[PDB]
Symmetry: D2
Subunit: 308 residues, 4 copies
């Protein structure tokens, strides 16, 4: 069976195990630095299997050795943000956590695809590839699938149609400078601009950019985890089942969109090989101005990162 290790048994990590367990994709190992929490959640999720009717070996541990030879490593060990806080504000703390987790996990699963979740996403994914020394295409960050999910939900709501017939690409760093792409958004093949007037669409775009903060302000004591976990799980599945999914993820660029040496949200084809191909959309001038704005923001965090 496939082996999936989730490093950090917090809200996102545990919910990822939940979405995953239901798909019967393989053994799931929940690791955490706090004793009892992963073991407890693992056992509890395990005990639900007879009810839901899924066969899954879910275990919790505080020992990295238990993650050895994993096919996929999900990193959700970073500290979350509190209201009135920015994802980059977490960089110093999460950089240490991320470095700690990667340096211990990577060596034990050299053939694993690492899916980073810790914020700030782009900078942490970059730090992961950097610490693991893994092939760039096997070190990616979850962000775009979530961002686009929010965006697609808002448009489905606004248009009054099933979220099943809604697709939308979105690029950039996982932050305020985020860049949803209305031109690359459709409903059963039809441009969304045909369904939503410019003013409403622009609001939707703004809501998408602040989507994470919106939830943080409501919860007060934590950040989102249902959508984020669902996104992470869709990526794990893409990899384990080599589905060749076309989705936005934080991938290492070497010139695409005119950007180099940076993890940035771009559309890719996800499969057993991890990032199998980085798509290069024909973005117009407006879109590119937005994209470049985001690029500059991410670059900023990298400069912060490199000085830590």
């Amino acid at each position: 069976r496939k082996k999936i290790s989730i490093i950090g048994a917090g809200f996102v990590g545990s919910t990822t195990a939940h979405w995953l367990a239901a798909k019967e994709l393989g053994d799931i190992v929940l690791l955490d630095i706090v004793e009892g929490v992963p073991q407890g959640k693992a056992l509890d999720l395990y005990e639900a299997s007879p009810i839901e009717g899924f066969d899954v070996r879910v275990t919790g541990t505080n020992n990295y050795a238990d993650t050895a030879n994993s096919d996929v490593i999900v990193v959700t060990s970073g500290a979350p943000r509190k209201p009135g806080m920015s994802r980059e504000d977490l960089i110093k703390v999460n950089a240490d956590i991320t470095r700690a987790c990667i340096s211990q996990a990577a060596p034990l699963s050299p053939n694993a695809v690492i899916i980073m979740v810790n914020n700030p996403l782009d900078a942490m994914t970059y730090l992961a590839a950097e610490v693991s020394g893994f092939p760039k295409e096997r070190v990616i960050g979850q962000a775009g699938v979530l961002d686009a999910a929010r965006y697609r939900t808002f448009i489905a709501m606004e248009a009054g149609v099933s979220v099943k017939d809604v697709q939308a690409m979105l690029m950039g760093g996982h932050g305020d400078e985020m860049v949803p792409l209305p031109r690359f958004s459709t409903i059963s093949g039809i441009p969304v601009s045909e369904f939503i007037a410019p003013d409403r669409l622009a609001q939707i775009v703004e809501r998408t950019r602040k989507g994470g903060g919106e939830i943080v302000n409501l919860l007060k004591t934590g950040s989102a985890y249902y959508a984020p976990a669902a996104a992470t799980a869709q990526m794990v599945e893409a990899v384990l089942k080599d589905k060749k999914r076309v989705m936005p993820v934080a991938a290492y660029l070497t010139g695409q969109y005119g950007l180099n040496d940076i993890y940035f949200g771009v559309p890719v084809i996800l499969g057993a090989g991890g990032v199998e191909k980085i798509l290069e959309l024909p973005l117009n001038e407006e879109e590119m101005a937005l994209l470049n704005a985001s690029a500059k923001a991410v670059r900023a965090t990298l400069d912060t990162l490199k000085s830590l």
Copy 2:
């Protein structure tokens, strides 16, 4: 529980019950004019429930009375075509079958949404609305969902990506004059033209138009049923769960696209009310020439129909 009556327990009818049963959408009644066939298939499908683990009341009958008060009526009682035959070639035979089924079923389920499948699709759907006297929006034909499914499969194959991230609109009568719309086809929001060169895409378009014949030539003794049944079931589900799905179906037009008094494949929003809204895409000159060609073909069958 919701009640779904499938008139005609042949290949498409039975496979529809199969796709449906697995979704637990309600009671399923399989009706046929031949004794034993529906009862046999009903019982056999019923006996699979303990294995698949779905609760469904599937019954077979030769008595229309058993279809009374159905929420949805699926009509798959028409005679299929043999190789080297055209769907319109079935018009005379299937017109009588269709008239017979509708006149007996409709009265028993006045509040039902009728989903026609019998070929020639557009002309038979028109005959159904005509015989049932039902509100035009509650009498629709399955065709576009199938045609587009074929089209989406070919592009997924060609592009090497999951069929999950592929959407494509397609219009016109369910025939050779069919009109897939590459401009209204995307992969995770991205135009397919970005993935498939014009020559290959044009082949895909041609294959889509002949997709049904392709399968007929292979099977020799019958026509497709897996995809067709899956399409019909997706529509039944859209209705029963009021999903507001954006999909192409044969709907009654009153001026849309410049067409009037005709059942034609157009994108609609499908829900509890049946055809809840007919979308009007901004089709360019080329697309419209194609659309008008298809319109003329359908009109021809209607003229044939009306003279029967």
Copy 3:
């Protein structure tokens, strides 16, 4: 669409919405006293719908008015225990909370089936039937499914088989005096005794009874929720779909097993009418001794209740 209100959007209530959403059973309303909490969780979960592909309306609220006309009401507003506590220890705080939630919701959804979860389960379920005045059959408590789930899990683990083939009846109050029934537990119709040695089976019976506490001692700051939520969800589904599932639930006894006027974990046929039948099993003396000892523990919580 059906409507399900979940009073108390904490771990169990939110997780319950999660399992439920994936099932597309109908609209879900998450209510809580803390503002923002239910709104954020409902939005977060709603934003996962495009990723997972389900059409579900999940809303968060602080106003009982939003729960009006619900078909089912899940109550998960109770405070959870910490290590060292018994479920009975929560009776003072939760009797108040429970009375508050039921007095407000019940009047608004007169035809609903109320499913209690708050601990102590059997007492709280009695209280809810009392405060609501609803027919006893439409007021039930979730406990048996969860308890039997832990039991079935330990069995599958021990026998090295799939949980999908393990069935097991479990009776009594949701507490330490809980009565797992080895003689009424089978693997694909084969008595469990044929797979597990008595001594081992005994340890399993014991682990089952102490299952909740095992998790509490691991989590340390909360109690189980994945299995509990799954259990609650299955019950919600049984009612909404009128599945007529045979399962153990805290129901109102009027003489069965020689017990009167108490809510007790017994096997029932759960459907659209709530408890549609209470099964009276031919328990033997050893089993009846365990059952009576449990009914005694329950009656004791009820006397504490009436004392509040």
Copy 4:
């Protein structure tokens, strides 16, 4: 991805691909002697993937070379019976067909688990083990699951409960002497006798044994396929996923139940190694009398076999 080859693309084989596709277990190869048949059905089913949303490679072929390196081989090439025939009546024609299919496929997929379906089931499964020379554990016949499925269905129907709660062991040869075991059949762990009266239960035991013929007499031009396919699929899944399901399958006995050198319907733990364990149940005299009578009917088909 895993690979599954289905030899014989008729009703059972095609339907088996259908159930399988929906499960996304891996690539499926439909093979047949008639050209076009497997190609059309595989394409048709493949074109349903966008509608249903599964990523499955389904190919049709007439060349055994395409079945190379399969993980599992389903054999459904046998001729089906017509009203008036017994399954044994097909032994001459199907022994030939079966030998032909196994001699060609087995050599190409040496590590595969072969699952026979062709009737007479027990004899054909023995033949396949013989012609293939594969370890007996990796050659099994599908029969028990289907037989017990019909039984569980009749029970649920009679008891007015959900098939999801009915378990039932069934042993012996896949013929009239089939042995459903009431004493080894439970509803949520509760003996079936507690729900159905002996006289009624007897009629059910009898209906089960004659289940196949009931359908044959209804269809008239073929035999059951939905349940058979579902049964076969569950077995394929058990192997591919290494679920360790406890179920009745025609396995090779070397003394169990005092039977040697025959393929017989017995309970086993089915996993990645095929039959990983044969369970020896404490049947009583009445049950052993039925079992022996069945083993006699089976030995008789084997003597007919060796006579071909």
